[PDB]
Amino acid sequence: DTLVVTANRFEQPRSTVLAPTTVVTRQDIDRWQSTSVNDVLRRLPGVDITQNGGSGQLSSIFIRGTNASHVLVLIDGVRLNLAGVSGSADLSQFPIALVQRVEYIRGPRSAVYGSDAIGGVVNIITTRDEPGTEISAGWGSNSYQNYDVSTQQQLGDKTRVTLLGDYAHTHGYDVVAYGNTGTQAQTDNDGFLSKTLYGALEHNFTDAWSGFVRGYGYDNRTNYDADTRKLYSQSWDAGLRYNGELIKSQLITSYSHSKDYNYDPHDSSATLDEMKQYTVQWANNVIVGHGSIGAGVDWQKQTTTPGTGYVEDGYDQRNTGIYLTGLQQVGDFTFEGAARSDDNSQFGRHGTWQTSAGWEFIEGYRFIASYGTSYKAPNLGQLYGFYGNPNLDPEKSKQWEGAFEGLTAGVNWRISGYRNDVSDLIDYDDHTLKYYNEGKARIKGVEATANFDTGPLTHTVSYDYVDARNAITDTPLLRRAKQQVKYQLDWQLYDFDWGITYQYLGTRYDKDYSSYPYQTVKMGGVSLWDLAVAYPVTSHLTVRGKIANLFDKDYETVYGYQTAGREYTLSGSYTF
Numbered sequence: 001d002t003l004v005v006t007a008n009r010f011e012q013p014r015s016t017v018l019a020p021t022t023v024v025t026r027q028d029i030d031r032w033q034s035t036s037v038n039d040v041l042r043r044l045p046g047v048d049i050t051q052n053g054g055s056g057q058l059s060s061i062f063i064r065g066t067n068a069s070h071v072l073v074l075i076d077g078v079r080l081n082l083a084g085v086s087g088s089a090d091l092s093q094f095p096i097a098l099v100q101r102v103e104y105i106r107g108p109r110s111a112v113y114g115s116d117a118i119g120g121v122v123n124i125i126t127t128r129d130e131p132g133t134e135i136s137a138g139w140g141s142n143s144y145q146n147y148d149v150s151t152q153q154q155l156g157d158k159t160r161v162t163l164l165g166d167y168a169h170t171h172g173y174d175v176v177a178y179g180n181t182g183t184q185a186q187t188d189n190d191g192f193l194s195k196t197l198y199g200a201l202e203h204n205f206t207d208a209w210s211g212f213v214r215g216y217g218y219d220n221r222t223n224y225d226a227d228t229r230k231l232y233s234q235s236w237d238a239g240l241r242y243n244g245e246l247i248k249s250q251l252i253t254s255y256s257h258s259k260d261y262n263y264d265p266h267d268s269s270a271t272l273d274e275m276k277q278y279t280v281q282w283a284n285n286v287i288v289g290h291g292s293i294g295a296g297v298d299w300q301k302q303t304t305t306p307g308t309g310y311v312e313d314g315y316d317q318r319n320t321g322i323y324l325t326g327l328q329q330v331g332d333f334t335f336e337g338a339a340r341s342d343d344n345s346q347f348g349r350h351g352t353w354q355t356s357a358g359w360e361f362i363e364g365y366r367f368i369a370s371y372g373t374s375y376k377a378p379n380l381g382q383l384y385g386f387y388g389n390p391n392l393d394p395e396k397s398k399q400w401e402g403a404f405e406g407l408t409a410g411v412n413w414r415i416s417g418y419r420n421d422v423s424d425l426i427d428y429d430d431h432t433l434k435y436y437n438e439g440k441a442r443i444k445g446v447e448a449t450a451n452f453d454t455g456p457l458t459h460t461v462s463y464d465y466v467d468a469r470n471a472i473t474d475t476p477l478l479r480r481a482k483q484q485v486k487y488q489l490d491w492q493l494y495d496f497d498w499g500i501t502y503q504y505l506g507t508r509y510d511k512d513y514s515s516y517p518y519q520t521v522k523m524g525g526v527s528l529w530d531l532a533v534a535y536p537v538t539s540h541l542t543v544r545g546k547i548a549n550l551f552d553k554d555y556e557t558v559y560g561y562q563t564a565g566r567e568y569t570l571s572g573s574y575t576f
């Protein structure tokens with residue numbers, strides 16, 4: 001699709017969004033045959049994701065060079081629950097079987113959404129309009145197994161129902177470990193089992209007035225090393241929507257409750273984390289000329305259990321923000337903007353804002369200037385942990401960005417450079433065994449994308465340069481590749497749909513924890529290749545297969561944790 005929602009909360013056509021943005025749909029994923037959300041995001045511009053091995057293992061998403069907690073991940077609009085305890089997003093446990101759509105807008109959006117939107121935003125949408133029931137599942141190269149039953153149907157005039165179950169499981173391959181593990185080893189394939197359940201009830205009172213109720217949860221258990229971690233999550237949403245010709249409005253609610261254990265192996269000696277986050281937001285938008293204007297109020301409650309986050313007492317964190325959005329188109333120029341004020345139960349008030357203007361100085365070509373401001377809340381652990389500091393302020397970012405975007409000779413392209421200066425970075429002082437706000441980073445980047453067709457061939461290429469450094473010491477930051485290259489090539493032929501995807505993961509610096517003291521290591525970086533194919537046996541059956549890492553490239557995204565290697569997958573789906 002070409003109209004997202006994530007930018008200002010309500011539908012608008014992407015072309016109207018001045019910030020770089022990307023959309024992935026459910027048809028994409030099925031094609032891509034992704035078995036995990038990281039797989040999907042790893043493909044898109046500006047994304048650098050690392051992982052302690054295969055599937056289920058902790059992972060980190062760095063967008064355009066920012067720390068891993070500097071990305072806001074929303075599910076169906078709402079701040080990712082899993083991110084709550086740690087103050088940092090990791091989709092590693094989120095069920096891909098719930099993903100219907102994803103919308104990703106890079107750059108700051110705190111001025112719309114609050115804390116965490118620094119690098120950009122990620123909005124995983126779990127909703128579809130696609131009636132019928134579908135059965136599917138697959139088999140693969142490490143006992144990977146999956147099966148899943150889905151269906152959406154009508155329940156009479158104006159009400160529709162959605163139901164879904166899915167179970168995927170693939171014991172692993174040992175992810176060695178290094179640094180961690182200590183004395184012995186872990187000669188054991190570290191599996192992950194995920195079982196999901198999802199149900200939605202959508203209701204139109206009228207042609208404009210709508211309503212819904214969803215409920216979903218998953219029970220995961222993905223063993224790691226140097227320990228089996230068992231995770232339960234459930235979330236609940238319900239809202240009303242009015243969508244008129246001129247006036248749009250939404251009122252939304254949600255509650256998610258998570259329980260994240262790790263044993264064992266076999267009680268006593270295990271840290272359970274438990275969070276309950278409560279959200280209510282109200283937002284309006286109206287069409288005004290060739291533009292819109294908008295505002296909403298947005299409230300949050302997160303309360304944690306004692307022991308959670310390795311923090312002494314339970315905590316009850318509250319936040320309320322209020323913001324204003326605008327888009328106007330005039331003549332050849334475009335203006336878009338937002339401003340927010342947030343009142344946090346801990347640090348108080350902090351406001352934020354962004355503007356961008358574009359000039360289409362010649363048909364099909366557009367020059368865009370953006371300046372935007374964002375923030376990142378301190379987390380429990382910096383606040384109330386053994387080394388805590390309850391008076392921390394938020395970490396603060398300023399970004400400037402220029403772009404040229406245009407359609408020339410059958411090819412759509414864009415090229416941006418941004419600068420991101422982060423400040424008040426929450427860092428630990430050995431001197432006082434406390435955290436304080438003090439660090440700086442400067443990030444210097446370049447994104448270039450392009451898609452275009454040449455015969456039955458479709459190309460979708462992207463390139464990123466990230467110079468992310470500690471601004472005081474002038475040194476590169478770790479865990480981040482300076483350069484990635486991503487290319488997808490799609491084409492059909494006889495009745496076979498093909499896709500080859502190529503990635504080059506640049507060279508990164510990390511640390512070697514196997515042993516103290518902990519030395520920095522330079523990882524060379526590689527090229528990876530996956531190949532995929534599907535074929536409609538009938539009109540109802542489609543069979544696919546995939547070779548991932550088609551050559552057998554050995555590499556790590558995190559020093560010491562072994563990655564998959566070449567895996568095979570054979571899969572199918574049956575719609576009726």
Ligand SMILES: CCCCCCCCOCCOCCOCCOCCO
Pocket residue numbers: 293324325326327328335336337338339353354355
């Ligand atoms: C009705 C409020 C519209 C602006 C809300 C966000 C504005 C935040 O800073 C924007 C101002 O700085 C540049 C002003 O010129 C264009 C503002 O953006 C036009 C919004 O469509």
Ligand SMILES: CCCCCCCCOCCOCCOCCOCCO
Pocket residue numbers: 338339353
């Ligand atoms: C919706 C429009 C919001 C406009 C945001 C941009 C304007 C921000 O003003 C200046 C930013 O820094 C604010 C402090 O102003 C100067 C502080 O000087 C006094 C120091 O004690």
Ligand SMILES: CCCCCCCCOCCOCCOCCOCCO
Pocket residue numbers: 295322323324339340341350351352353
């Ligand atoms: C309708 C809600 C309006 C939200 C706009 C405020 C967003 C944050 O303010 C703009 C950026 O921050 C500038 C404010 O910082 C200066 C604070 O000045 C406070 C002096 O009381």
Ligand SMILES: CCCCCCCCOCCOCCOCCOCCO
Pocket residue numbers: 362365404406408
């Ligand atoms: C940084 C981006 C620079 C953009 C320069 C584009 C300027 C003009 O580009 C296209 C102009 O059209 C001429 C190219 O071929 C014309 C095709 O039109 C067919 C009949 O005239």
Ligand SMILES: CCCCCCCCOCCOCCOCCOCCO
Pocket residue numbers: 402403404415416417418419443444445446
């Ligand atoms: C308008 C898009 C800028 C195009 C990037 C390639 C051309 C660069 O020209 C000079 C190179 O600048 C060196 C810095 O490179 C990274 C800087 O990125 C953004 C920091 O301002």
Ligand SMILES: CCCCCCCCOCCOCCOCCOCCO
Pocket residue numbers: 413414415446448449450461462463465
């Ligand atoms: C990129 C400079 C040329 C002007 C834009 C060309 C359109 C780019 O589309 C292709 C992008 O795919 C890889 C681009 O690599 C070229 C630029 O990398 C330069 C970094 O300074």
Ligand SMILES: [Ca+2]
Pocket residue numbers: 174175176185186187188189190224225
């Ligand atoms: Ca192991």
Ligand SMILES: [Ca+2]
Pocket residue numbers: 186188189190223224225227
């Ligand atoms: Ca193990």
Ligand SMILES: [Ca+2]
Pocket residue numbers: 360363364
């Ligand atoms: Ca035009």
Ligand SMILES: [Ca+2]
Pocket residue numbers: 429430431
């Ligand atoms: Ca120091």
